[PDB]
Amino acid sequence: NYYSSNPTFYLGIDCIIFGFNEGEISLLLLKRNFEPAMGEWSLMGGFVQKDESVDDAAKRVLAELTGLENVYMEQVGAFGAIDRDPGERVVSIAYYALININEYDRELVQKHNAYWVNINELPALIFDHPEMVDKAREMMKQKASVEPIGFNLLPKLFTLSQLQSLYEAIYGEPMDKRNFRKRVAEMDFIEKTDKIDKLGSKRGAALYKFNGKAYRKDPKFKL
Amino acid sequence: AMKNYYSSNPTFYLGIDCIIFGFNEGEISLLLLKRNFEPAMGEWSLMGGFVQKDESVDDAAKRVLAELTGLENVYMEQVGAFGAIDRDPGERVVSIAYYALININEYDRELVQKHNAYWVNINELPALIFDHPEMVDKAREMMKQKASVEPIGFNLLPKLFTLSQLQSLYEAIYGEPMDKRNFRKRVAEMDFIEKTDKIDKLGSKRGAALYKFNGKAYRKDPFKL
């Protein structure tokens, strides 16, 4: 009764999907195999349905591309400039996700014509997607300094050089090897295993694990 | 082929909701509606509205705020998009919450009276309808974080303020007492907080030195207190 004199709008979802590999952060991007903007680069996206909450729409859109569930996700914001989408008025809610770049459904990715691209060497993204990406990076950077969300970008078992390399990539600057390793030593919820990562016959390094339960007993993450 | 790329999807009401912070006599307050309209007439809520066809989401938030307070060029931050299915039991509404910092000594009182709105101490709030309590919590958390790293607090104060008022404000932001001496030191070292030759006079017996925030000077060189 009360709300009907107001207009209604398409509610897009757009996903900034972060991955980490070989000292580089990358985004999972569509090279669109559909109109509008076929052939152009964009974030993975969709629309909110009547079935679902906005949060669940984000989960669904991410699962449609990657097959993943229970993904670490944060809402970035609601982008609502009038002409952000030239085809129609669409207000899009952006989310970012941190996934293990080693674990996703390769079939689904191939069928969406999607690609991992280094975050500092992105092609031109359509619409206001470049803007969304900028805001997502800034928020993730900020959160990753005060909370251990970084470990979602790594496999369950990781080495310290891998971990250092992650934080070097997040902040785009080198870190002192020595004192970084002391910060981890006195961080109790980062447990050292008896397993090693064996890249090759000449390469090995101790594998560590992130202990979620032990972190929440004392949420003192800072590095 | 893309003929129904858009139209195959549903459309939703886009709500606007404003958490409006004020500060006065050492307390942070929120400007709330005791609704004089339905739904939830007689219950307490945030100031609200809906995005229209001619306007962006941010401009909707400005408009809504202006409808209540008459204020423009207000410091505002988008809090988030709240899109749980049943947040509004009457109808499906995805609402985009904003917070605003205003000077409680300057607003349109008849506009506020028209909307039957009242300032309430943020620690002694009435029950708010729908998911408004969740919006306030998130807004408080965000505003607190931002105020430690940027000088957004000065929007809560008059152009001229005493260090006593400033300290009081930050004590209220952080809900804890601060060391008067160390606080004075951090303000003395900030060049963009200029001391004035004016004093705040309450009676003939009360006086205190007034200060000013110089945004120009600040943006030349950025704040931590």
Numbering used by the authors:
A (entry chain A): 3 to 225
B (entry chain B): 0 to 221, 223 to 225
Article, verbatim:
In this study we identified and characterized a novel L-arabinose-responsive transcription factor found in the Bacteroides species, which belongs to the NrtR family of Nudix-related transcriptional regulators. The NrtR family transcription factors are characterized by an N-terminal Nudix hydrolase-like effector-binding domain and a C-terminal DNA-binding domain. In this work, genome-scale regulon inference using the comparative genomics approach revealed that the NrtR family AraR regulators in Bacteroides and Prevotella spp. control not only the L-arabinose catabolic operons, but also several other gene loci involved in the utilization of arabinose-containing polysaccharides. The predicted AraR-regulated operons are involved in the uptake and catabolism of L-arabinose and the decomposition of arabinose-containing polysaccharides (e.g., arabinan, arabinoxylan, pectic galactan) to oligosaccharides, their translocation into the periplasm, and further hydrolysis.
We determined the structures of full-length apo–BtAraR protein, its complex with a specific DNA duplex, and its complex with the L-arabinose effector. The solved structures provide a first view of the structural mechanism underlying the regulatory function of the L-arabinose-binding Nudix domain. The Nudix signature motif GX5-EX7REUXEEXGU (where U is a hydrophobic residue and X is any residue) is strictly conserved in all known active Nudix hydrolases, but it is impaired in the NrtR regulators of NAD metabolism, several of which are known to be enzymatically inactive. Similarly to NrtR regulators, the Nudix signature motif is not conserved in the AraR proteins from Bacteroidetes, where two or three glutamate residues are substituted with other amino acids. These observations suggest that AraR regulators are also enzymatically inactive and utilize their Nudix hydrolase-like domains for ligand binding.
